[PDB]
Amino acid sequence: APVTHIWYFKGVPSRLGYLLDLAPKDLEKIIYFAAYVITSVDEEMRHNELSTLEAEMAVERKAVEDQRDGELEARAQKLEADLAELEAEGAKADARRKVRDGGEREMRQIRDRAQRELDRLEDIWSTFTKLAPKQLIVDENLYRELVDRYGEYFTGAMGAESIQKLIENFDIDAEAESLRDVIRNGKGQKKLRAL
Amino acid sequence: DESEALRQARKDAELTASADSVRAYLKQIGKVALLNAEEEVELAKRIEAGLYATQLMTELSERGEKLPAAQRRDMMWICRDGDRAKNHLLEANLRLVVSLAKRYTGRGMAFLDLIQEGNLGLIRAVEKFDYTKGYKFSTYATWWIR
Amino acid sequence: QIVERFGFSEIMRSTLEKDNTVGTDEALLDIYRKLRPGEPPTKESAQTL
Amino acid sequence: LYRRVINRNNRLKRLIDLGAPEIIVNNEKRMLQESVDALFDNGRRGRP
DNA sequence: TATAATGGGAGCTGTCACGGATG
DNA sequence: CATCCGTGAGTCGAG
């Protein structure tokens, strides 16, 4: 398994970091296997299906919401039905307030559980849409969910050999002049890091 | 009881990876859940099916002839589901190794190297496991890892 | 009790005021989060260490 | 140190061959990485 | 090599003066 | 202008 020369990685300024415009701390989480790194993406194939991929993701987002508003309804039914059942028993009205706040606690949880799913489903679609070389996906379960769904659309790897891949598909001549353009611009702090 | 703060706080810590190469491996193991006695049996059942579909096709490739597209595909899936089960059991009792790998610390060989070789014995352990005897996996493992 | 014991000074009053969070649970969790990141914060795991 | 690397390089070989889960294989690799690192420049990264 | 066994463990202590990256 | 990490801090000899 390929392995990176520590002289070029940990020596500051981090030569590898500068080369790939990768962060010194982000480089770490990669080489030593703490965070996956996107290696290459078929942007075209993404585009030519982006319309259909959106609709599909959408249907899941709807079907998640639909259960939520349904699940919530049935609890609201039984919340009102129980409050009256303890009323037919003639319980103290204060003893019903316990049952009241109980329901409102259960419904909140339900909504939050669903909402977390929808936020995850959001964080998934957002991430896939805006995917590109040199992106770090530190969250694992996302990346697993990211491969399972759209694994045909990009190339994700991890560790010292992924960084090997990044160097192969590195265009020196291109990345060079690109730095010279930021140099031609007066903007100091960004000219600093481009110098 | 469960605040939104904690729920955000928990994912923040868990997501960040520590600097200690030892700790970072521990945290990885704690993900998969320990196995129920009958859960262990299940995987054993699958691996047996999985391990066997493989031995079928192995000698067949040498002799030549092969299964139809319907049989081979159905045969092939067991071979995958099996090789997937095996990987699950290993990840389950991956704690077990590190349990009795701490005990050989400070003996002229590193902790991690101890745990690895440890896992290396665990891989052989799950292969020759048998669920016919009602013994949990943990006992036929320990003797193999040690 | 914080106001009681250390109230004679303005620097401690200025401290309890600028205090970010309150609550016995939220304090233990807070310290746990800054001591050992990478580990799930139980209310029983921050009380223990 | 050389004896350290080759021990971990070889152990990777056996692991890859045996078809180990990714959690095990990667752990070796990571170790292999710190082992080459420790030999080239010790103490630079992490504890010596 | 079949009872069952499932997440580590020592930390290290009293510098000093500087450049570069960050603020 | 003030922090954090990594790198300097005399020579020979002796045991």
Side-chain angles (χ1 to χ4, degrees), chain A residues 1-186 188-195, chain B residues 2-146, chain C, chain D:
Chain A
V3 49
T4 71
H5 200 331
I6 200 185
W7 258 19
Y8 294 119
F9 155 71
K10 192 63 179 181
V12 288
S14 145
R15 281 79 187 181
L16 253 184
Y18 278 23
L19 178 67
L20 303 187
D21 202 35
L22 274 169
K25 180 51 187 174
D26 286 351
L27 205 51
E28 275 233 13
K29 301 169 175 291
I30 302 176
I31 306 216
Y32 296 73
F33 296 84
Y36 286 81
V37 45
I38 295 304
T39 62
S40 61
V41 51
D42 190 351
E43 301 180 341
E44 197 195 33
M45 188 172 180
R46 178 171 50 170
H47 192 257
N48 298 336
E49 300 282 316
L50 184 48
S51 67
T52 311
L53 288 170
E54 174 169 7
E56 289 192 338
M57 161 73 49
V59 178
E60 191 190 352
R61 271 196 65 89
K62 164 170 173 302
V64 161
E65 291 177 346
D66 261 339
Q67 177 185 349
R68 171 189 67 186
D69 312 327
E71 188 174 339
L72 286 177
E73 263 290 341
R75 188 57 192 101
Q77 296 281 355
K78 201 193 182 305
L79 177 58
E80 207 73 29
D82 277 334
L83 282 178
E85 182 178 0
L86 303 196
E87 181 183 1
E89 299 164 6
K92 188 176 58 184
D94 205 322
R96 310 171 185 178
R97 186 59 61 172
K98 179 185 179 181
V99 190
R100 165 67 80 181
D101 305 319
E104 298 180 4
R105 186 51 181 172
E106 279 198 26
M107 308 219 304
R108 271 178 288 154
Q109 293 174 9
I110 296 170
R111 175 168 265 105
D112 281 343
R113 289 200 203 105
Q115 195 64 30
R116 287 195 226 98
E117 173 84 13
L118 288 167
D119 290 12
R120 241 182 58 230
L121 269 176
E122 189 180 348
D123 285 352
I124 293 171
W125 176 262
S126 170
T127 301
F128 165 72
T129 310
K130 298 180 277 189
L131 200 90
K134 306 174 183 177
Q135 292 185 225
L136 280 81
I137 314 171
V138 54
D139 193 328
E140 188 168 338
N141 314 279
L142 152 61
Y143 178 84
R144 182 175 298 113
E145 271 263 39
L146 216 52
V147 169
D148 179 32
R149 285 174 179 263
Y150 311 99
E152 296 186 314
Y153 292 85
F154 71 96
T155 314
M158 179 191 229
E161 54 182 309
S162 49
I163 307 218
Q164 185 177 32
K165 191 63 191 302
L166 264 299
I167 302 168
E168 190 171 26
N169 317 132
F170 179 90
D171 196 338
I172 313 171
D173 290 326
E175 283 259 1
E177 308 304 319
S178 310
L179 289 167
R180 291 197 169 85
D181 259 8
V182 188
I183 286 174
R184 292 318 187 120
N185 289 338
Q189 186 183 10
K190 307 179 67 176
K191 181 168 62 70
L192 280 181
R193 294 167 187 171
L195 269 182
Chain B
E2 179 190 36
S3 300
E4 291 184 346
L6 212 169
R7 183 51 180 164
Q8 307 282 28
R10 168 187 165 182
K11 191 177 176 61
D12 290 332
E14 185 272 345
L15 190 132
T16 314
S18 294
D20 181 29
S21 52
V22 175
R23 179 176 276 182
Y25 167 69
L26 286 172
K27 126 169 154 295
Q28 282 300 95
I29 319 167
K31 294 180 172 175
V32 189
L34 307 178
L35 238 63
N36 181 348
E38 46 182 357
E39 279 177 20
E40 290 181 351
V41 181
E42 170 205 312
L43 304 186
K45 249 159 137 50
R46 282 205 276 167
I47 297 167
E48 281 213 356
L51 187 72
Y52 218 15
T54 315
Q55 179 64 298
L56 171 65
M57 312 181 305
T58 308
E59 288 222 294
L60 296 201
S61 181
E62 179 180 7
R63 71 131 45 180
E65 36 194 358
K66 55 194 74 173
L67 291 191
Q71 282 195 12
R72 198 199 301 102
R73 283 183 64 86
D74 196 20
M75 201 66 54
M76 211 62 176
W77 186 88
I78 307 296
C79 171
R80 298 182 188 92
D81 163 66
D83 199 86
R84 175 186 291 107
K86 149 187 172 302
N87 282 12
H88 188 274
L89 191 39
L90 288 183
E91 287 182 309
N93 299 269
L94 186 37
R95 299 189 177 193
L96 179 59
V97 173
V98 197
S99 121
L100 44 86
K102 62 184 182 181
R103 311 180 179 184
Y104 302 74
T105 189
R107 297 286 208 84
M109 197 164 61
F111 195 15
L112 294 147
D113 282 320
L114 271 158
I115 306 181
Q116 279 297 81
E117 292 274 349
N119 301 339
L120 193 57
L122 179 61
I123 302 184
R124 277 131 66 178
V126 69
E127 296 297 335
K128 293 87 179 179
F129 179 88
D130 158 86
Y131 69 96
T132 303
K133 321 158 202 181
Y135 308 146
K136 286 200 53 182
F137 176 85
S138 62
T139 174
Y140 179 62
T142 305
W143 288 101
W144 257 103
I145 313 175
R146 256 189 315 191
Chain C
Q1 281 185 294
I2 307 179
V3 183
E4 175 191 24
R5 184 65 176 270
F6 310 91
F8 59 90
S9 70
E10 193 64 24
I11 60 109
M12 277 299 293
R13 290 298 183 85
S14 183
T15 310
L16 184 59
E17 204 273 325
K18 294 170 186 171
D19 160 55
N20 201 335
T21 65
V22 74
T24 308
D25 278 333
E26 311 303 318
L28 295 171
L29 292 170
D30 180 35
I31 302 181
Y32 185 99
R33 275 174 283 179
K34 302 285 189 172
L35 213 167
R36 294 179 185 233
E39 307 161 14
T42 316
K43 303 193 192 66
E44 287 303 305
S45 66
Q47 178 87 44
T48 305
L49 64 89
Chain D
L1 298 183
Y2 281 128
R3 198 174 50 80
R4 213 180 192 80
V5 168
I6 318 165
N7 251 328
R8 292 189 188 178
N9 183 36
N10 282 349
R11 203 191 296 122
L12 169 62
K13 271 187 174 65
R14 272 298 310 264
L15 280 173
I16 290 186
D17 207 40
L18 284 179
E22 280 301 298
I23 180 57
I24 301 171
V25 184
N26 286 331
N27 190 80
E28 190 73 18
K29 294 188 170 184
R30 172 158 52 84
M31 279 159 41
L32 174 53
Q33 174 89 27
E34 309 187 348
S35 327
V36 180
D37 273 6
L39 153 70
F40 277 135
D41 196 21
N42 191 349
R44 175 64 74 120
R45 182 174 191 281
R47 280 196 169 90

PDB file of all heavy atoms in Angstrom, chain D residues 3 6-7 12-13 15 17 25-26 28-29 31 34-37 39 41-42 44 46:
ATOM      1  N   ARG D   3      12.814  -3.429  10.598  1.00  0.00           N
ATOM      2  CA  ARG D   3      12.143  -4.644  11.024  1.00  0.00           C
ATOM      3  C   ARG D   3      10.701  -4.339  11.418  1.00  0.00           C
ATOM      4  O   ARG D   3       9.838  -5.216  11.403  1.00  0.00           O
ATOM      5  CB  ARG D   3      12.895  -5.299  12.185  1.00  0.00           C
ATOM      6  CG  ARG D   3      12.535  -6.752  12.405  1.00  0.00           C
ATOM      7  CD  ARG D   3      13.420  -7.359  13.464  1.00  0.00           C
ATOM      8  NE  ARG D   3      13.439  -6.521  14.654  1.00  0.00           N
ATOM      9  CZ  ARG D   3      12.483  -6.525  15.574  1.00  0.00           C
ATOM     10  NH1 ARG D   3      11.436  -7.328  15.439  1.00  0.00           N
ATOM     11  NH2 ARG D   3      12.571  -5.727  16.628  1.00  0.00           N
ATOM     12  N   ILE D   6       8.659  -3.832   7.662  1.00  0.00           N
ATOM     13  CA  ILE D   6       8.485  -5.101   6.953  1.00  0.00           C
ATOM     14  C   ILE D   6       7.499  -6.024   7.645  1.00  0.00           C
ATOM     15  O   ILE D   6       6.781  -6.784   7.000  1.00  0.00           O
ATOM     16  CB  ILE D   6       9.799  -5.865   6.816  1.00  0.00           C
ATOM     17  CG1 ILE D   6      10.938  -4.924   6.467  1.00  0.00           C
ATOM     18  CG2 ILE D   6       9.673  -6.930   5.752  1.00  0.00           C
ATOM     19  CD1 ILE D   6      12.280  -5.538   6.676  1.00  0.00           C
ATOM     20  N   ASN D   7       7.480  -5.959   8.968  1.00  0.00           N
ATOM     21  CA  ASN D   7       6.519  -6.720   9.746  1.00  0.00           C
ATOM     22  C   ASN D   7       5.103  -6.249   9.469  1.00  0.00           C
ATOM     23  O   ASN D   7       4.165  -7.045   9.456  1.00  0.00           O
ATOM     24  CB  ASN D   7       6.823  -6.610  11.238  1.00  0.00           C
ATOM     25  CG  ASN D   7       7.360  -7.899  11.815  1.00  0.00           C
ATOM     26  OD1 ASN D   7       6.996  -8.989  11.372  1.00  0.00           O
ATOM     27  ND2 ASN D   7       8.232  -7.783  12.809  1.00  0.00           N
ATOM     28  N   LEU D  12       0.093  -6.678   6.169  1.00  0.00           N
ATOM     29  CA  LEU D  12      -0.873  -6.137   5.220  1.00  0.00           C
ATOM     30  C   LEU D  12      -1.153  -7.130   4.103  1.00  0.00           C
ATOM     31  O   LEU D  12      -2.301  -7.345   3.723  1.00  0.00           O
ATOM     32  CB  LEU D  12      -0.362  -4.820   4.634  1.00  0.00           C
ATOM     33  CG  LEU D  12      -1.142  -4.260   3.445  1.00  0.00           C
ATOM     34  CD1 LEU D  12      -2.573  -3.946   3.849  1.00  0.00           C
ATOM     35  CD2 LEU D  12      -0.452  -3.026   2.886  1.00  0.00           C
ATOM     36  N   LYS D  13      -0.091  -7.726   3.574  1.00  0.00           N
ATOM     37  CA  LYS D  13      -0.213  -8.672   2.473  1.00  0.00           C
ATOM     38  C   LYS D  13      -1.145  -9.817   2.836  1.00  0.00           C
ATOM     39  O   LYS D  13      -2.029 -10.177   2.070  1.00  0.00           O
ATOM     40  CB  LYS D  13       1.162  -9.228   2.077  1.00  0.00           C
ATOM     41  CG  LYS D  13       1.920  -8.425   1.034  1.00  0.00           C
ATOM     42  CD  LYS D  13       3.175  -9.183   0.612  1.00  0.00           C
ATOM     43  CE  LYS D  13       3.913  -8.501  -0.528  1.00  0.00           C
ATOM     44  NZ  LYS D  13       4.448  -7.173  -0.125  1.00  0.00           N
ATOM     45  N   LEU D  15      -3.355  -9.848   5.184  1.00  0.00           N
ATOM     46  CA  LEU D  15      -4.691  -9.341   5.441  1.00  0.00           C
ATOM     47  C   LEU D  15      -5.460  -9.095   4.146  1.00  0.00           C
ATOM     48  O   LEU D  15      -6.614  -9.511   4.017  1.00  0.00           O
ATOM     49  CB  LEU D  15      -4.618  -8.066   6.271  1.00  0.00           C
ATOM     50  CG  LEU D  15      -4.414  -8.329   7.760  1.00  0.00           C
ATOM     51  CD1 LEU D  15      -4.191  -7.033   8.505  1.00  0.00           C
ATOM     52  CD2 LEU D  15      -5.612  -9.060   8.320  1.00  0.00           C
ATOM     53  N   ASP D  17      -4.935 -10.432   1.268  1.00  0.00           N
ATOM     54  CA  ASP D  17      -5.165 -11.740   0.675  1.00  0.00           C
ATOM     55  C   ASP D  17      -6.352 -12.458   1.311  1.00  0.00           C
ATOM     56  O   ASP D  17      -7.205 -12.995   0.604  1.00  0.00           O
ATOM     57  CB  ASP D  17      -3.921 -12.612   0.801  1.00  0.00           C
ATOM     58  CG  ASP D  17      -3.831 -13.644  -0.297  1.00  0.00           C
ATOM     59  OD1 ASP D  17      -4.166 -13.294  -1.447  1.00  0.00           O
ATOM     60  OD2 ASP D  17      -3.440 -14.796  -0.013  1.00  0.00           O
ATOM     61  N   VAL D  25      -8.049  -3.918   7.493  1.00  0.00           N
ATOM     62  CA  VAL D  25      -7.085  -3.574   6.458  1.00  0.00           C
ATOM     63  C   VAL D  25      -6.559  -2.163   6.624  1.00  0.00           C
ATOM     64  O   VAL D  25      -5.360  -1.914   6.528  1.00  0.00           O
ATOM     65  CB  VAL D  25      -7.697  -3.679   5.053  1.00  0.00           C
ATOM     66  CG1 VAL D  25      -6.630  -3.415   3.999  1.00  0.00           C
ATOM     67  CG2 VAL D  25      -8.342  -5.035   4.846  1.00  0.00           C
ATOM     68  N   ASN D  26      -7.474  -1.236   6.868  1.00  0.00           N
ATOM     69  CA  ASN D  26      -7.104   0.164   6.977  1.00  0.00           C
ATOM     70  C   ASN D  26      -6.243   0.408   8.207  1.00  0.00           C
ATOM     71  O   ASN D  26      -5.298   1.195   8.166  1.00  0.00           O
ATOM     72  CB  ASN D  26      -8.353   1.049   6.997  1.00  0.00           C
ATOM     73  CG  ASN D  26      -9.001   1.157   5.631  1.00  0.00           C
ATOM     74  OD1 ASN D  26      -8.328   1.052   4.608  1.00  0.00           O
ATOM     75  ND2 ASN D  26     -10.312   1.357   5.606  1.00  0.00           N
ATOM     76  N   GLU D  28      -4.094  -1.549   9.552  1.00  0.00           N
ATOM     77  CA  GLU D  28      -2.746  -1.941   9.170  1.00  0.00           C
ATOM     78  C   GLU D  28      -2.087  -0.839   8.379  1.00  0.00           C
ATOM     79  O   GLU D  28      -1.002  -0.378   8.715  1.00  0.00           O
ATOM     80  CB  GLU D  28      -2.766  -3.222   8.333  1.00  0.00           C
ATOM     81  CG  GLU D  28      -1.393  -3.818   8.090  1.00  0.00           C
ATOM     82  CD  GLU D  28      -0.826  -4.473   9.334  1.00  0.00           C
ATOM     83  OE1 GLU D  28      -1.606  -4.762  10.265  1.00  0.00           O
ATOM     84  OE2 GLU D  28       0.400  -4.696   9.379  1.00  0.00           O
ATOM     85  N   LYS D  29      -2.764  -0.443   7.309  1.00  0.00           N
ATOM     86  CA  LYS D  29      -2.269   0.589   6.416  1.00  0.00           C
ATOM     87  C   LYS D  29      -1.851   1.816   7.216  1.00  0.00           C
ATOM     88  O   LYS D  29      -0.706   2.251   7.137  1.00  0.00           O
ATOM     89  CB  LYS D  29      -3.331   0.965   5.372  1.00  0.00           C
ATOM     90  CG  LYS D  29      -3.679  -0.138   4.385  1.00  0.00           C
ATOM     91  CD  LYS D  29      -4.592   0.386   3.290  1.00  0.00           C
ATOM     92  CE  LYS D  29      -4.752  -0.622   2.171  1.00  0.00           C
ATOM     93  NZ  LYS D  29      -5.558  -0.071   1.048  1.00  0.00           N
ATOM     94  N   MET D  31      -1.091   2.065  10.231  1.00  0.00           N
ATOM     95  CA  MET D  31       0.095   1.682  10.983  1.00  0.00           C
ATOM     96  C   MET D  31       1.322   1.631  10.101  1.00  0.00           C
ATOM     97  O   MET D  31       2.401   2.043  10.509  1.00  0.00           O
ATOM     98  CB  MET D  31      -0.107   0.327  11.635  1.00  0.00           C
ATOM     99  CG  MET D  31      -0.896   0.368  12.911  1.00  0.00           C
ATOM    100  SD  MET D  31      -1.569  -1.259  13.249  1.00  0.00           S
ATOM    101  CE  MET D  31      -0.178  -2.296  12.803  1.00  0.00           C
ATOM    102  N   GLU D  34       2.587   5.185   9.693  1.00  0.00           N
ATOM    103  CA  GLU D  34       3.331   5.731  10.822  1.00  0.00           C
ATOM    104  C   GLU D  34       4.673   5.022  10.994  1.00  0.00           C
ATOM    105  O   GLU D  34       5.584   5.554  11.625  1.00  0.00           O
ATOM    106  CB  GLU D  34       2.512   5.622  12.109  1.00  0.00           C
ATOM    107  CG  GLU D  34       1.108   6.189  11.993  1.00  0.00           C
ATOM    108  CD  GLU D  34       0.368   6.219  13.315  1.00  0.00           C
ATOM    109  OE1 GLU D  34       0.847   5.588  14.278  1.00  0.00           O
ATOM    110  OE2 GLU D  34      -0.688   6.879  13.395  1.00  0.00           O
ATOM    111  N   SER D  35       4.788   3.824  10.422  1.00  0.00           N
ATOM    112  CA  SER D  35       5.981   2.988  10.568  1.00  0.00           C
ATOM    113  C   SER D  35       7.084   3.430   9.619  1.00  0.00           C
ATOM    114  O   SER D  35       8.265   3.413   9.959  1.00  0.00           O
ATOM    115  CB  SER D  35       5.640   1.523  10.311  1.00  0.00           C
ATOM    116  OG  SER D  35       4.322   1.230  10.729  1.00  0.00           O
ATOM    117  N   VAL D  36       6.677   3.816   8.417  1.00  0.00           N
ATOM    118  CA  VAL D  36       7.573   4.421   7.446  1.00  0.00           C
ATOM    119  C   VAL D  36       7.931   5.825   7.901  1.00  0.00           C
ATOM    120  O   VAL D  36       9.045   6.303   7.690  1.00  0.00           O
ATOM    121  CB  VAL D  36       6.926   4.474   6.052  1.00  0.00           C
ATOM    122  CG1 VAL D  36       7.864   5.097   5.051  1.00  0.00           C
ATOM    123  CG2 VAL D  36       6.526   3.081   5.607  1.00  0.00           C
ATOM    124  N   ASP D  37       6.969   6.481   8.540  1.00  0.00           N
ATOM    125  CA  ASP D  37       7.168   7.832   9.044  1.00  0.00           C
ATOM    126  C   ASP D  37       8.140   7.836  10.216  1.00  0.00           C
ATOM    127  O   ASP D  37       9.009   8.701  10.318  1.00  0.00           O
ATOM    128  CB  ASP D  37       5.828   8.450   9.457  1.00  0.00           C
ATOM    129  CG  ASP D  37       5.111   9.125   8.293  1.00  0.00           C
ATOM    130  OD1 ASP D  37       5.596   9.028   7.144  1.00  0.00           O
ATOM    131  OD2 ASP D  37       4.062   9.760   8.521  1.00  0.00           O
ATOM    132  N   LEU D  39      10.457   5.747  10.756  1.00  0.00           N
ATOM    133  CA  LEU D  39      11.780   5.338  10.307  1.00  0.00           C
ATOM    134  C   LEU D  39      12.504   6.477   9.601  1.00  0.00           C
ATOM    135  O   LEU D  39      13.701   6.683   9.798  1.00  0.00           O
ATOM    136  CB  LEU D  39      11.676   4.132   9.383  1.00  0.00           C
ATOM    137  CG  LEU D  39      12.802   3.997   8.358  1.00  0.00           C
ATOM    138  CD1 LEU D  39      14.118   3.641   9.022  1.00  0.00           C
ATOM    139  CD2 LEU D  39      12.436   2.969   7.317  1.00  0.00           C
ATOM    140  N   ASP D  41      11.675   9.905   9.825  1.00  0.00           N
ATOM    141  CA  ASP D  41      11.847  10.988  10.779  1.00  0.00           C
ATOM    142  C   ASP D  41      11.049  10.678  12.031  1.00  0.00           C
ATOM    143  O   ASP D  41       9.831  10.809  12.044  1.00  0.00           O
ATOM    144  CB  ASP D  41      11.414  12.323  10.170  1.00  0.00           C
ATOM    145  CG  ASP D  41      11.922  13.512  10.959  1.00  0.00           C
ATOM    146  OD1 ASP D  41      12.900  13.338  11.710  1.00  0.00           O
ATOM    147  OD2 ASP D  41      11.354  14.618  10.830  1.00  0.00           O
ATOM    148  N   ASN D  42      11.742  10.253  13.080  1.00  0.00           N
ATOM    149  CA  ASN D  42      11.075   9.846  14.304  1.00  0.00           C
ATOM    150  C   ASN D  42      10.748  11.039  15.169  1.00  0.00           C
ATOM    151  O   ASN D  42      11.550  11.956  15.302  1.00  0.00           O
ATOM    152  CB  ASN D  42      11.935   8.849  15.084  1.00  0.00           C
ATOM    153  CG  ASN D  42      11.181   8.199  16.223  1.00  0.00           C
ATOM    154  OD1 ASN D  42      10.082   8.618  16.567  1.00  0.00           O
ATOM    155  ND2 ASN D  42      11.770   7.173  16.815  1.00  0.00           N
ATOM    156  N   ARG D  44       8.748  13.407  14.663  1.00  0.00           N
ATOM    157  CA  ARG D  44       8.165  14.486  13.875  1.00  0.00           C
ATOM    158  C   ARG D  44       6.653  14.472  13.999  1.00  0.00           C
ATOM    159  O   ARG D  44       6.048  15.461  14.402  1.00  0.00           O
ATOM    160  CB  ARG D  44       8.563  14.367  12.408  1.00  0.00           C
ATOM    161  CG  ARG D  44       7.887  15.392  11.528  1.00  0.00           C
ATOM    162  CD  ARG D  44       8.316  16.793  11.910  1.00  0.00           C
ATOM    163  NE  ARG D  44       9.675  17.058  11.459  1.00  0.00           N
ATOM    164  CZ  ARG D  44      10.004  18.035  10.619  1.00  0.00           C
ATOM    165  NH1 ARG D  44       9.073  18.857  10.144  1.00  0.00           N
ATOM    166  NH2 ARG D  44      11.270  18.199  10.260  1.00  0.00           N
ATOM    167  N   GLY D  46       3.477  12.993  15.955  1.00  0.00           N
ATOM    168  CA  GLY D  46       3.019  12.322  17.159  1.00  0.00           C
ATOM    169  C   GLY D  46       4.142  12.064  18.140  1.00  0.00           C
ATOM    170  O   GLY D  46       5.147  12.776  18.146  1.00  0.00           O
TER     171      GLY D  46
END
